[model samples]
Target: MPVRRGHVAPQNTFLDTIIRKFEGQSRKFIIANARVENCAVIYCNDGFCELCGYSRAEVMQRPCTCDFLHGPRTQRRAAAQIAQALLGAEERKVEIAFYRKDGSCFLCLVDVVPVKNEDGAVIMFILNFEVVMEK
Candidate 1:
């Protein structure tokens, strides 16, 4: 018998390595436009860059940094975890403070995962986060 060859639905296809890394994670975004960056294969979420006072283009133009996310207290642990994940370590959970474009800070949870090949080597890091603000 001949093997079947048929088109697969785009949605039915397996998740790409980058997105698959975000599986089992939940991310939330606000109504306001925010800035997101994929640096070192890790995604950085900057809340509402315009609302926070930065020009939209400015926020999107460069790799996201602690200078833009956390004001005085840098998200050191989160940064380190992201770094480690990129190096092929196990996935990690992180909660860090992120600054608005205007400089205000908010607590956000993050899940950092390493995208691996069939050989189980790290290829990229995926950062998933949600804004945690006071009601």
Candidate 2:
């Protein structure tokens, strides 16, 4: 028999080593920190972006949470896991695979709750982080 010469490649193959590292460690963490939930009345902003070492990044992100992290790829239970964890957590929550928008990348967990607008009927949400573990 002749040797096979197939070179099939993974279509979704990623080049980010950090994403790979995240695949191992961050998936657990993102799944942990990504617990997002909306309080429906209060709690929207404040003390949100300090962890990212940048100015409050949660300003006016219409459909945030893991929206930036998840895209359509995540939804259903994972999104629900996010919504449920933060609602009850208060230091008792979940974790993810995400980056804080820059040249490089890494994995982390977060949860931006979905809320209802006060007057305009727009909408709202809150914030959290599992970014502390990368140290």
Candidate 3:
């Protein structure tokens, strides 16, 4: 699908400020535009790229539509539920399978945290992917 462009956080906007916090953290995480119809990946660090086995360019600005991460065995119900929950802009802790760039899959505890602006609106979401054991 043709997705939109990545967010422009020029010269330290609110989003850019928070985004810089994890620019090179060892933990895997991704930030998505919470306001978008289908929240797309806006920023991801090297750890995220490494965990998913994809280059930063490959994942940027793509809808969190499961195309790059989910596979056949992925639980459809859970995935659907997650999407709905995401729209709610609430905190969620979910265990889901995400596919790597090489077509391999890994299970992780995805901690979806919604970041709100001073005016109390969710501008973006930070999803921390904590990888678990045994595929």
RMSD of each: 12.3, 17.5, 4.1
Best by lDDT: 3
Candidate 1 C-alpha lDDT tens digits along 11-122:
5336555564665423431111111233421222344333345553454333333234665665686766644543445766666676665446777665655556677665
Identify the leading candidate in terms of TM-score.
Answer: 3
Query: By TM-score, is 2 or 3 better?
Result: 3
Cα RMSD, model 1: 12.3
On a 0 to 100 scale, what is the lDDT of residue 17 in model 2?
Answer: 52
lDDT of 2 by residue, 68-134 (tens): 5543333455556655645542333345544444423444566444334445332333455555344
Q: lDDT-based ranking, best first?
A: 3, 1, 2
TM-score of each: 0.48, 0.35, 0.78
Give the lDDT of residue 68 in candidate 2. Answer: 50
Q: What lDDT is reached at residue 66 by model 3?
A: 48
Could you tell me how far off, in angstroms, the CA of residue 40 lies in candidate 1 after the best superposition?
Answer: 3.5
Q: Please list the C-alpha lDDT of all candidates, in the order they appear.
A: 0.46, 0.39, 0.74
Segments of candidate 1 deviating more than 4 angstroms: 1-67, 133-135
